[PDB]
PDB file of C-alpha atoms and ligand atoms in Angstrom:
ATOM      1  CA  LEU Q  16      11.673   6.921  19.320  1.00 56.34           C
ATOM      2  CA  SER Q  17       9.634  10.148  19.014  1.00 56.67           C
ATOM      3  CA  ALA Q  18      12.832  12.274  18.558  1.00 53.95           C
ATOM      4  CA  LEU Q  19      12.186  12.492  14.747  1.00 50.50           C
ATOM      5  CA  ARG Q  20      13.145  15.243  12.235  1.00 48.51           C
ATOM      6  CA  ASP Q  21      11.063  18.349  11.262  1.00 49.23           C
ATOM      7  CA  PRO Q  22       9.709  17.914   7.679  1.00 50.56           C
ATOM      8  CA  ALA Q  23      10.788  21.474   6.585  1.00 50.08           C
ATOM      9  CA  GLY Q  24      12.696  21.339   3.327  1.00 46.60           C
ATOM     10  CA  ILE Q  25      12.182  17.533   2.982  1.00 46.56           C
ATOM     11  CA  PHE Q  26       8.379  17.151   2.449  1.00 51.33           C
ATOM     12  CA  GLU Q  27       5.725  19.710   1.505  1.00 49.28           C
ATOM     13  CA  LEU Q  28       1.912  19.442   1.707  1.00 50.18           C
ATOM     14  CA  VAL Q  29       0.172  20.035  -1.663  1.00 52.76           C
ATOM     15  CA  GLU Q  30      -3.603  19.266  -1.300  1.00 55.22           C
ATOM     16  CA  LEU Q  31      -5.877  17.398   1.144  1.00 54.38           C
ATOM     17  CA  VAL Q  32      -7.000  14.030  -0.333  1.00 54.82           C
ATOM     18  CA  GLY Q  33      -8.424  12.009   2.579  1.00 58.34           C
ATOM     19  CA  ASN Q  34     -10.825  12.639   5.486  1.00 57.56           C
ATOM     20  CA  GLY Q  35     -12.096   9.322   6.855  1.00 59.07           C
ATOM     21  CA  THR Q  36     -11.563   6.907   9.802  1.00 57.89           C
ATOM     22  CA  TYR Q  37      -7.772   7.312   9.126  1.00 57.00           C
ATOM     23  CA  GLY Q  38      -7.907  11.133   9.698  1.00 59.05           C
ATOM     24  CA  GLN Q  39      -6.628  14.144   7.635  1.00 56.28           C
ATOM     25  CA  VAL Q  40      -4.481  12.829   4.711  1.00 56.05           C
ATOM     26  CA  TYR Q  41      -2.616  15.124   2.295  1.00 56.37           C
ATOM     27  CA  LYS Q  42      -0.974  14.704  -1.115  1.00 55.92           C
ATOM     28  CA  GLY Q  43       2.643  15.584  -0.272  1.00 54.11           C
ATOM     29  CA  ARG Q  44       5.789  16.160  -2.354  1.00 54.31           C
ATOM     30  CA  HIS Q  45       9.411  15.204  -1.628  1.00 55.14           C
ATOM     31  CA  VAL Q  46      11.322  18.480  -2.172  1.00 53.18           C
ATOM     32  CA  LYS Q  47      14.589  17.117  -3.664  1.00 51.61           C
ATOM     33  CA  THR Q  48      13.116  14.430  -5.958  1.00 50.06           C
ATOM     34  CA  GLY Q  49       9.638  15.842  -6.686  1.00 52.36           C
ATOM     35  CA  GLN Q  50       8.091  12.447  -5.929  1.00 51.27           C
ATOM     36  CA  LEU Q  51       4.556  12.310  -4.489  1.00 48.20           C
ATOM     37  CA  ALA Q  52       3.658  10.747  -1.141  1.00 49.26           C
ATOM     38  CA  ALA Q  53       0.577  10.473   1.099  1.00 53.78           C
ATOM     39  CA  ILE Q  54       1.098  12.418   4.327  1.00 54.05           C
ATOM     40  CA  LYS Q  55      -1.246  11.709   7.282  1.00 57.19           C
ATOM     41  CA  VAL Q  56      -1.096  14.720   9.646  1.00 61.54           C
ATOM     42  CA  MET Q  57      -2.032  13.981  13.279  1.00 63.46           C
ATOM     43  CA  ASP Q  58      -1.806  16.117  16.458  1.00 63.68           C
ATOM     44  CA  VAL Q  59       0.748  14.606  18.869  1.00 62.81           C
ATOM     45  CA  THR Q  60      -0.420  15.020  22.517  1.00 62.60           C
ATOM     46  CA  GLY Q  61       0.886  13.648  25.844  1.00 63.14           C
ATOM     47  CA  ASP Q  62      -1.896  11.024  26.233  1.00 64.18           C
ATOM     48  CA  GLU Q  63      -2.207   9.810  22.576  1.00 65.47           C
ATOM     49  CA  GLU Q  64       1.388   8.509  21.978  1.00 67.54           C
ATOM     50  CA  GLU Q  65       1.215   4.702  22.533  1.00 69.96           C
ATOM     51  CA  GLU Q  66      -1.408   4.218  19.723  1.00 69.34           C
ATOM     52  CA  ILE Q  67       0.629   6.305  17.180  1.00 72.25           C
ATOM     53  CA  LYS Q  68       3.931   4.456  17.923  1.00 69.84           C
ATOM     54  CA  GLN Q  69       2.132   1.049  17.435  1.00 67.88           C
ATOM     55  CA  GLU Q  70       0.781   2.160  13.977  1.00 69.79           C
ATOM     56  CA  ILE Q  71       4.315   3.213  12.829  1.00 72.63           C
ATOM     57  CA  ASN Q  72       5.870  -0.161  13.869  1.00 73.27           C
ATOM     58  CA  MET Q  73       3.052  -2.069  12.058  1.00 74.72           C
ATOM     59  CA  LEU Q  74       3.744  -0.001   8.893  1.00 73.19           C
ATOM     60  CA  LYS Q  75       7.592  -0.189   9.206  1.00 72.67           C
ATOM     61  CA  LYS Q  76       7.412  -4.057   9.446  1.00 74.30           C
ATOM     62  CA  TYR Q  77       4.388  -5.068   7.309  1.00 76.16           C
ATOM     63  CA  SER Q  78       3.880  -2.468   4.528  1.00 73.06           C
ATOM     64  CA  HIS Q  79       6.627  -3.875   2.277  1.00 73.32           C
ATOM     65  CA  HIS Q  80       4.266  -5.899   0.012  1.00 72.14           C
ATOM     66  CA  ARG Q  81       3.034  -4.691  -3.460  1.00 73.12           C
ATOM     67  CA  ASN Q  82      -0.651  -4.753  -2.354  1.00 68.92           C
ATOM     68  CA  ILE Q  83      -0.035  -2.555   0.739  1.00 68.55           C
ATOM     69  CA  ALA Q  84       0.876   1.189   0.531  1.00 69.00           C
ATOM     70  CA  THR Q  85       4.547   1.477   1.602  1.00 69.86           C
ATOM     71  CA  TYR Q  86       5.701   3.340   4.711  1.00 72.12           C
ATOM     72  CA  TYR Q  87       8.271   6.039   3.759  1.00 74.05           C
ATOM     73  CA  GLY Q  88       8.930   7.672   7.135  1.00 73.53           C
ATOM     74  CA  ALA Q  89       7.685   9.846  10.009  1.00 72.82           C
ATOM     75  CA  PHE Q  90       8.302  13.498  11.019  1.00 71.69           C
ATOM     76  CA  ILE Q  91       7.282  15.816  13.876  1.00 73.41           C
ATOM     77  CA  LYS Q  92       6.405  19.394  12.980  1.00 74.40           C
ATOM     78  CA  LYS Q  93       7.445  21.431  16.099  1.00 73.23           C
ATOM     79  CA  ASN Q  94       5.024  24.419  16.660  1.00 76.30           C
ATOM     80  CA  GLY Q  97      -0.745  26.987  22.138  1.00 74.47           C
ATOM     81  CA  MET Q  98      -0.542  24.990  18.877  1.00 70.47           C
ATOM     82  CA  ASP Q  99       0.199  21.273  19.585  1.00 69.66           C
ATOM     83  CA  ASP Q 100       2.975  19.452  17.568  1.00 69.38           C
ATOM     84  CA  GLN Q 101       1.941  17.487  14.451  1.00 69.10           C
ATOM     85  CA  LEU Q 102       3.138  14.091  13.398  1.00 69.02           C
ATOM     86  CA  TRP Q 103       3.514  13.456   9.643  1.00 69.94           C
ATOM     87  CA  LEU Q 104       3.042   9.854   8.531  1.00 69.60           C
ATOM     88  CA  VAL Q 105       4.711   9.536   5.086  1.00 70.79           C
ATOM     89  CA  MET Q 106       3.215   6.761   2.844  1.00 70.27           C
ATOM     90  CA  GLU Q 107       3.174   5.576  -0.809  1.00 71.99           C
ATOM     91  CA  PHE Q 108       0.794   7.741  -2.824  1.00 71.91           C
ATOM     92  CA  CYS Q 109      -2.223   6.173  -4.603  1.00 72.00           C
ATOM     93  CA  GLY Q 110      -3.281   8.791  -7.168  1.00 68.86           C
ATOM     94  CA  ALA Q 111      -6.531   7.199  -8.447  1.00 67.61           C
ATOM     95  CA  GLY Q 112      -8.140   7.301  -4.973  1.00 68.96           C
ATOM     96  CA  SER Q 113     -10.330   4.665  -3.259  1.00 70.94           C
ATOM     97  CA  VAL Q 114     -12.599   1.870  -4.559  1.00 67.55           C
ATOM     98  CA  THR Q 115     -15.478   3.910  -2.911  1.00 65.01           C
ATOM     99  CA  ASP Q 116     -14.563   6.879  -5.217  1.00 65.33           C
ATOM    100  CA  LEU Q 117     -14.301   4.441  -8.205  1.00 64.37           C
ATOM    101  CA  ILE Q 118     -17.887   3.233  -7.485  1.00 64.26           C
ATOM    102  CA  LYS Q 119     -19.156   6.852  -7.044  1.00 60.81           C
ATOM    103  CA  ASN Q 120     -17.577   7.917 -10.386  1.00 60.75           C
ATOM    104  CA  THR Q 121     -18.785   4.869 -12.405  1.00 60.90           C
ATOM    105  CA  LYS Q 122     -22.196   5.246 -14.145  1.00 62.96           C
ATOM    106  CA  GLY Q 123     -24.964   3.356 -12.326  1.00 64.56           C
ATOM    107  CA  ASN Q 124     -22.644   3.047  -9.248  1.00 68.20           C
ATOM    108  CA  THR Q 125     -21.658  -0.592 -10.055  1.00 66.10           C
ATOM    109  CA  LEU Q 126     -18.342  -2.126 -11.200  1.00 64.00           C
ATOM    110  CA  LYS Q 127     -17.915  -4.682 -14.053  1.00 64.59           C
ATOM    111  CA  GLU Q 128     -17.613  -8.238 -12.639  1.00 65.88           C
ATOM    112  CA  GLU Q 129     -14.114  -8.609 -14.257  1.00 64.64           C
ATOM    113  CA  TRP Q 130     -12.940  -5.449 -12.356  1.00 63.72           C
ATOM    114  CA  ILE Q 131     -14.341  -6.842  -9.046  1.00 65.15           C
ATOM    115  CA  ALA Q 132     -12.395 -10.125  -9.581  1.00 65.10           C
ATOM    116  CA  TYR Q 133      -9.119  -8.161 -10.212  1.00 65.19           C
ATOM    117  CA  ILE Q 134      -9.622  -5.849  -7.167  1.00 65.93           C
ATOM    118  CA  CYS Q 135     -10.682  -8.815  -4.912  1.00 66.97           C
ATOM    119  CA  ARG Q 136      -7.605 -10.853  -6.010  1.00 69.16           C
ATOM    120  CA  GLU Q 137      -5.266  -7.940  -5.119  1.00 67.41           C
ATOM    121  CA  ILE Q 138      -6.955  -7.408  -1.684  1.00 71.14           C
ATOM    122  CA  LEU Q 139      -6.657 -11.199  -1.079  1.00 72.17           C
ATOM    123  CA  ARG Q 140      -2.905 -11.170  -1.960  1.00 78.75           C
ATOM    124  CA  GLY Q 141      -2.311  -8.240   0.461  1.00 79.93           C
ATOM    125  CA  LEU Q 142      -4.418  -9.979   3.151  1.00 80.83           C
ATOM    126  CA  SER Q 143      -2.398 -13.208   2.553  1.00 82.00           C
ATOM    127  CA  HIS Q 144       0.832 -11.195   3.272  1.00 82.10           C
ATOM    128  CA  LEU Q 145      -0.652  -9.793   6.535  1.00 82.70           C
ATOM    129  CA  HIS Q 146      -2.123 -13.119   7.669  1.00 81.78           C
ATOM    130  CA  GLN Q 147       1.256 -14.904   7.014  1.00 79.93           C
ATOM    131  CA  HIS Q 148       2.762 -12.315   9.429  1.00 79.40           C
ATOM    132  CA  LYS Q 149      -0.086 -13.043  11.984  1.00 77.23           C
ATOM    133  CA  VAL Q 150      -1.619  -9.534  11.439  1.00 77.85           C
ATOM    134  CA  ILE Q 151      -5.395  -8.871  11.059  1.00 78.96           C
ATOM    135  CA  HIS Q 152      -6.235  -5.676   9.095  1.00 78.16           C
ATOM    136  CA  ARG Q 153      -9.575  -5.294  11.041  1.00 78.37           C
ATOM    137  CA  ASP Q 154     -10.902  -2.547   8.655  1.00 76.10           C
ATOM    138  CA  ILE Q 155     -11.355  -3.915   5.125  1.00 77.96           C
ATOM    139  CA  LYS Q 156     -13.706  -1.626   3.111  1.00 77.93           C
ATOM    140  CA  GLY Q 157     -13.701   0.248  -0.265  1.00 80.70           C
ATOM    141  CA  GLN Q 158     -12.560   3.426   1.578  1.00 81.89           C
ATOM    142  CA  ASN Q 159      -9.370   1.450   2.631  1.00 83.13           C
ATOM    143  CA  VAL Q 160      -8.655  -0.133  -0.782  1.00 82.53           C
ATOM    144  CA  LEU Q 161      -6.847   2.358  -3.008  1.00 79.39           C
ATOM    145  CA  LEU Q 162      -5.718   2.467  -6.640  1.00 78.66           C
ATOM    146  CA  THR Q 163      -2.555   3.982  -8.143  1.00 79.19           C
ATOM    147  CA  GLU Q 164      -2.586   5.968 -11.446  1.00 76.38           C
ATOM    148  CA  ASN Q 165      -1.395   2.725 -13.195  1.00 80.78           C
ATOM    149  CA  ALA Q 166      -4.405   0.866 -11.575  1.00 83.63           C
ATOM    150  CA  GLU Q 167      -2.320  -1.074  -8.946  1.00 84.07           C
ATOM    151  CA  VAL Q 168      -4.360  -2.081  -5.813  1.00 85.06           C
ATOM    152  CA  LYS Q 169      -3.062  -1.122  -2.328  1.00 87.28           C
ATOM    153  CA  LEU Q 170      -4.493  -1.592   1.203  1.00 88.98           C
ATOM    154  CA  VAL Q 171      -4.390   1.342   3.698  1.00 88.81           C
ATOM    155  CA  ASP Q 172      -5.259   2.165   7.373  1.00 89.18           C
ATOM    156  CA  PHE Q 173      -3.687   0.089  10.187  1.00 91.87           C
ATOM    157  CA  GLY Q 174      -5.209   2.277  12.952  1.00 91.70           C
ATOM    158  CA  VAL Q 175      -7.876  -0.292  13.969  1.00 90.21           C
ATOM    159  CA  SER Q 176      -5.202  -3.050  13.501  1.00 88.36           C
ATOM    160  CA  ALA Q 177      -3.167  -1.185  16.225  1.00 88.87           C
ATOM    161  CA  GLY Q 191     -18.829   3.698  13.970  1.00 89.08           C
ATOM    162  CA  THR Q 192     -19.646   1.963  10.649  1.00 88.89           C
ATOM    163  CA  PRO Q 193     -20.280  -1.731  11.503  1.00 85.76           C
ATOM    164  CA  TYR Q 194     -21.441  -2.564   7.911  1.00 86.38           C
ATOM    165  CA  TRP Q 195     -18.222  -4.444   7.049  1.00 86.76           C
ATOM    166  CA  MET Q 196     -17.812  -6.093  10.525  1.00 87.39           C
ATOM    167  CA  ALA Q 197     -17.978  -9.914  10.709  1.00 80.97           C
ATOM    168  CA  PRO Q 198     -20.562 -11.549  13.109  1.00 80.06           C
ATOM    169  CA  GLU Q 199     -17.771 -12.909  15.405  1.00 81.51           C
ATOM    170  CA  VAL Q 200     -16.244  -9.404  15.836  1.00 80.83           C
ATOM    171  CA  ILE Q 201     -19.670  -7.962  16.879  1.00 80.20           C
ATOM    172  CA  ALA Q 202     -20.165 -11.003  19.218  1.00 81.83           C
ATOM    173  CA  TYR Q 211     -12.013 -14.022  16.275  1.00 84.59           C
ATOM    174  CA  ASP Q 212      -9.006 -14.348  13.889  1.00 83.74           C
ATOM    175  CA  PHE Q 213      -7.757 -13.641  10.290  1.00 85.59           C
ATOM    176  CA  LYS Q 214     -11.064 -15.016   8.835  1.00 91.38           C
ATOM    177  CA  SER Q 215     -12.931 -11.810   9.856  1.00 95.00           C
ATOM    178  CA  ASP Q 216     -11.038  -9.885   7.089  1.00 89.85           C
ATOM    179  CA  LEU Q 217     -12.484 -12.349   4.547  1.00 88.66           C
ATOM    180  CA  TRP Q 218     -16.054 -11.486   5.644  1.00 85.37           C
ATOM    181  CA  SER Q 219     -15.157  -7.778   5.098  1.00 82.05           C
ATOM    182  CA  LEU Q 220     -13.785  -8.677   1.609  1.00 81.59           C
ATOM    183  CA  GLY Q 221     -17.169 -10.271   0.791  1.00 81.18           C
ATOM    184  CA  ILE Q 222     -18.963  -7.090   1.998  1.00 79.18           C
ATOM    185  CA  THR Q 223     -16.506  -4.992  -0.102  1.00 77.45           C
ATOM    186  CA  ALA Q 224     -17.272  -7.230  -3.126  1.00 76.24           C
ATOM    187  CA  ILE Q 225     -21.054  -6.557  -2.624  1.00 74.37           C
ATOM    188  CA  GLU Q 226     -20.161  -2.825  -2.146  1.00 73.14           C
ATOM    189  CA  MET Q 227     -18.409  -2.956  -5.595  1.00 68.63           C
ATOM    190  CA  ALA Q 228     -21.316  -4.890  -7.149  1.00 68.20           C
ATOM    191  CA  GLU Q 229     -24.297  -2.929  -5.652  1.00 67.53           C
ATOM    192  CA  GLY Q 230     -22.714   0.463  -4.860  1.00 66.49           C
ATOM    193  CA  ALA Q 231     -23.183   0.167  -1.071  1.00 65.49           C
ATOM    194  CA  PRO Q 232     -22.725  -2.498   1.688  1.00 65.01           C
ATOM    195  CA  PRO Q 233     -25.762  -4.557   2.897  1.00 66.17           C
ATOM    196  CA  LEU Q 234     -27.768  -2.800   5.678  1.00 65.07           C
ATOM    197  CA  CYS Q 235     -26.341   0.653   4.614  1.00 66.30           C
ATOM    198  CA  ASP Q 236     -29.821   2.287   4.731  1.00 65.35           C
ATOM    199  CA  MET Q 237     -30.086   1.382   8.479  1.00 66.56           C
ATOM    200  CA  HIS Q 238     -28.722   3.127  11.593  1.00 68.90           C
ATOM    201  CA  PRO Q 239     -25.347   1.650  12.787  1.00 67.43           C
ATOM    202  CA  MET Q 240     -26.991   0.375  16.031  1.00 67.28           C
ATOM    203  CA  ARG Q 241     -29.619  -1.636  14.030  1.00 68.33           C
ATOM    204  CA  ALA Q 242     -26.843  -2.974  11.741  1.00 68.36           C
ATOM    205  CA  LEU Q 243     -24.775  -4.045  14.824  1.00 65.46           C
ATOM    206  CA  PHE Q 244     -27.895  -5.882  16.125  1.00 63.32           C
ATOM    207  CA  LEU Q 245     -28.888  -7.385  12.705  1.00 66.13           C
ATOM    208  CA  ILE Q 246     -25.454  -8.663  11.398  1.00 64.37           C
ATOM    209  CA  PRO Q 247     -25.130 -11.595  13.929  1.00 63.62           C
ATOM    210  CA  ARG Q 248     -28.893 -12.380  13.588  1.00 64.90           C
ATOM    211  CA  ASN Q 249     -29.672 -12.053   9.821  1.00 66.95           C
ATOM    212  CA  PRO Q 250     -28.482 -14.863   7.480  1.00 66.55           C
ATOM    213  CA  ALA Q 251     -25.290 -14.229   5.399  1.00 68.15           C
ATOM    214  CA  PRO Q 252     -25.968 -11.518   2.729  1.00 69.19           C
ATOM    215  CA  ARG Q 253     -26.186 -12.297  -1.010  1.00 71.31           C
ATOM    216  CA  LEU Q 254     -26.274 -10.258  -4.267  1.00 67.36           C
ATOM    217  CA  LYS Q 255     -29.720  -8.646  -4.896  1.00 66.90           C
ATOM    218  CA  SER Q 256     -29.605  -9.011  -8.743  1.00 67.19           C
ATOM    219  CA  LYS Q 257     -29.778 -12.277 -10.761  1.00 67.24           C
ATOM    220  CA  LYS Q 258     -27.520 -10.711 -13.503  1.00 66.64           C
ATOM    221  CA  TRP Q 259     -24.245 -11.711 -11.702  1.00 66.75           C
ATOM    222  CA  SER Q 260     -22.384 -14.899 -12.742  1.00 67.98           C
ATOM    223  CA  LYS Q 261     -22.648 -18.240 -10.824  1.00 66.26           C
ATOM    224  CA  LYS Q 262     -18.845 -17.990 -10.118  1.00 69.41           C
ATOM    225  CA  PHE Q 263     -19.246 -14.510  -8.477  1.00 67.72           C
ATOM    226  CA  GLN Q 264     -22.371 -15.678  -6.532  1.00 65.33           C
ATOM    227  CA  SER Q 265     -20.438 -18.707  -5.178  1.00 66.90           C
ATOM    228  CA  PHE Q 266     -17.427 -16.452  -4.238  1.00 67.58           C
ATOM    229  CA  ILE Q 267     -19.630 -14.141  -2.129  1.00 66.55           C
ATOM    230  CA  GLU Q 268     -21.253 -17.233  -0.492  1.00 67.51           C
ATOM    231  CA  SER Q 269     -17.740 -18.637   0.283  1.00 68.14           C
ATOM    232  CA  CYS Q 270     -16.612 -15.257   1.762  1.00 68.15           C
ATOM    233  CA  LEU Q 271     -19.823 -14.712   3.831  1.00 63.49           C
ATOM    234  CA  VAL Q 272     -20.089 -17.785   6.065  1.00 61.81           C
ATOM    235  CA  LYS Q 273     -21.451 -16.649   9.477  1.00 66.86           C
ATOM    236  CA  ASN Q 274     -19.707 -19.545  11.306  1.00 65.99           C
ATOM    237  CA  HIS Q 275     -16.063 -18.426  10.994  1.00 66.59           C
ATOM    238  CA  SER Q 276     -14.797 -21.973  11.817  1.00 70.09           C
ATOM    239  CA  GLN Q 277     -16.468 -23.086   8.515  1.00 68.54           C
ATOM    240  CA  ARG Q 278     -15.274 -19.938   6.564  1.00 66.53           C
ATOM    241  CA  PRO Q 279     -12.307 -20.600   4.177  1.00 67.12           C
ATOM    242  CA  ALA Q 280      -8.786 -19.293   4.857  1.00 65.90           C
ATOM    243  CA  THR Q 281      -7.035 -16.674   2.641  1.00 68.46           C
ATOM    244  CA  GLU Q 282      -5.046 -19.300   0.592  1.00 67.28           C
ATOM    245  CA  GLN Q 283      -8.271 -21.341   0.007  1.00 68.14           C
ATOM    246  CA  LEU Q 284     -10.231 -18.265  -1.209  1.00 65.83           C
ATOM    247  CA  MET Q 285      -7.352 -17.383  -3.611  1.00 67.49           C
ATOM    248  CA  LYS Q 286      -7.831 -20.833  -5.267  1.00 69.92           C
ATOM    249  CA  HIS Q 287     -11.600 -20.118  -5.848  1.00 69.04           C
ATOM    250  CA  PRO Q 288     -12.530 -20.045  -9.614  1.00 68.26           C
ATOM    251  CA  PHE Q 289     -13.671 -16.365  -9.385  1.00 67.92           C
ATOM    252  CA  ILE Q 290     -10.161 -15.263  -8.179  1.00 64.86           C
ATOM    253  CA  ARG Q 291      -8.137 -18.023  -9.949  1.00 64.19           C
ATOM    254  CA  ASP Q 292      -9.767 -17.728 -13.451  1.00 64.09           C
ATOM    255  CA  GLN Q 293      -9.174 -14.095 -14.595  1.00 60.59           C
ATOM    256  CA  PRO Q 294      -7.881 -14.288 -18.196  1.00 64.97           C
ATOM    257  CA  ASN Q 295      -7.730 -10.510 -18.844  1.00 61.98           C
ATOM    258  CA  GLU Q 296      -5.297  -9.494 -15.993  1.00 60.63           C
ATOM    259  CA  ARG Q 297      -3.552  -7.236 -18.566  1.00 60.90           C
ATOM    260  CA  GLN Q 298      -6.821  -6.176 -20.400  1.00 60.89           C
ATOM    261  CA  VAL Q 299      -8.777  -5.382 -17.147  1.00 62.51           C
ATOM    262  CA  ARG Q 300      -5.865  -3.270 -15.751  1.00 58.21           C
ATOM    263  CA  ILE Q 301      -5.793  -1.250 -19.069  1.00 61.82           C
ATOM    264  CA  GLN Q 302      -9.634  -0.751 -18.901  1.00 60.44           C
ATOM    265  CA  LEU Q 303      -9.401   0.477 -15.240  1.00 60.76           C
ATOM    266  CA  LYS Q 304      -6.462   2.787 -16.138  1.00 60.14           C
ATOM    267  CA  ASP Q 305      -8.582   4.262 -19.026  1.00 59.14           C
ATOM    268  CA  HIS Q 306     -11.524   4.773 -16.582  1.00 58.58           C
ATOM    269  CA  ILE Q 307      -9.095   6.579 -14.177  1.00 58.03           C
ATOM    270  CA  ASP Q 308      -7.799   8.812 -17.054  1.00 54.99           C
ATOM    271  CA  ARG Q 309     -11.399   9.714 -18.082  1.00 55.28           C
ATOM    272  CA  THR Q 310     -12.093  10.945 -14.499  1.00 55.14           C
ATOM    273  CA  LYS Q 311      -8.980  13.247 -14.434  1.00 52.65           C
ATOM    274  CA  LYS Q 312      -9.512  14.631 -18.008  1.00 54.99           C
ATOM    275  CA  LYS Q 313     -13.311  15.222 -17.631  1.00 57.76           C
ATOM    276  CA  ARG Q 314     -13.023  17.841 -14.800  1.00 57.36           C
TER     277      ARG Q 314
HETATM  278  O1  LIG B 401      -1.170   5.466   2.861  1.00 55.80           O
HETATM  279  C1  LIG B 401      -1.828   6.037   2.131  1.00 55.80           C
HETATM  280  N1  LIG B 401      -1.432   6.093   0.838  1.00 55.80           N
HETATM  281  C2  LIG B 401      -2.424   6.784   0.249  1.00 55.80           C
HETATM  282  O2  LIG B 401      -2.344   7.012  -0.822  1.00 55.80           O
HETATM  283  C3  LIG B 401      -3.410   7.133   1.082  1.00 55.80           C
HETATM  284  C4  LIG B 401      -3.025   6.620   2.383  1.00 55.80           C
HETATM  285  C5  LIG B 401      -3.940   6.855   3.495  1.00 55.80           C
HETATM  286  C6  LIG B 401      -3.727   6.516   4.841  1.00 55.80           C
HETATM  287  C7  LIG B 401      -2.346   6.922   5.265  1.00 55.80           C
HETATM  288  C8  LIG B 401      -1.847   6.641   6.607  1.00 55.80           C
HETATM  289  C9  LIG B 401      -2.754   6.009   7.488  1.00 55.80           C
HETATM  290  C10 LIG B 401      -4.015   5.683   7.065  1.00 55.80           C
HETATM  291  C11 LIG B 401      -4.511   5.926   5.780  1.00 55.80           C
HETATM  292  C12 LIG B 401      -5.214   7.534   3.297  1.00 55.80           C
HETATM  293  C13 LIG B 401      -5.556   7.987   2.064  1.00 55.80           C
HETATM  294  N2  LIG B 401      -6.661   8.627   1.724  1.00 55.80           N
HETATM  295  C14 LIG B 401      -6.627   8.877   0.412  1.00 55.80           C
HETATM  296  C15 LIG B 401      -7.553   9.512  -0.549  1.00 55.80           C
HETATM  297  C16 LIG B 401      -7.216   9.625  -1.918  1.00 55.80           C
HETATM  298  C17 LIG B 401      -6.028   9.172  -2.425  1.00 55.80           C
HETATM  299  O3  LIG B 401      -5.825   9.352  -3.799  1.00 55.80           O
HETATM  300  C18 LIG B 401      -4.928   8.480  -1.605  1.00 55.80           C
HETATM  301  C19 LIG B 401      -5.293   8.344  -0.145  1.00 55.80           C
HETATM  302  C20 LIG B 401      -4.630   7.780   0.975  1.00 55.80           C
HETATM  303 NA1  LIG B 402       4.275  -1.758  -0.313  1.00 55.65          NA
END
């Protein structure tokens, strides 16, 4: 019901943080408590109304898992200047996995960090898949980190371009397509960019269903990580493992430093804020 409250006196915009496939996202502040939130500001027209209402319902029902940024509420800023809808979400201070790769020296993440991040994406995906929901847009831009290095999934717009993370069956499907995208995100974390990044999106769209399943370029990566990527990236989706199966894989299952990897990531986050 689009008869929502005006945000005036409740939530205030502080700084713009996001500008991707999800739109114009701001770092907002709750006036009375001083708590931070992510506010997505979108122009509410006559035509575009059905797509916005579907995104809200998805968030209201499915965002209540620890690996998905929580929905806090929605507001309409009444205004020649069209009315704006404010989508209030849980704030993830450390930014995206894409930013984490860009800030790390040599644009590659430590294998132990990849395993932690992948496990958290997989847990969030498991929650969505249990509720018969496909994310449809898994990529480093959509995987965010909190200041305490907690991993949260964002953007349910596509759930309600850049084909680099798209599974062959999607280009040609079910929950298994998100697991292909996780594999591509894992390579993105390992190599700094997804396979076929250097090519035009049209060539990538043509090549993905035709080329054999991608693999890691370097021989430096562990046999466990190499097998994980191979398990994720199975072109024939019928033969690709489910979410619960992939969670049981040694790369995800055997992570002894869950406490010591989180502390390392938090220290890397703190070094980025302190140094400029
Ligand atoms: O929900 C969010 N929580 C967030 O923290 C957040 C969200 C979104 C986003 C919000 C609504 C719809 C789609 C994406 C985009 C975002 N871009 C961002 C860029 C940097 C950042 O630190 C946080 C976000 C961010
Ligand atoms: Na949540």
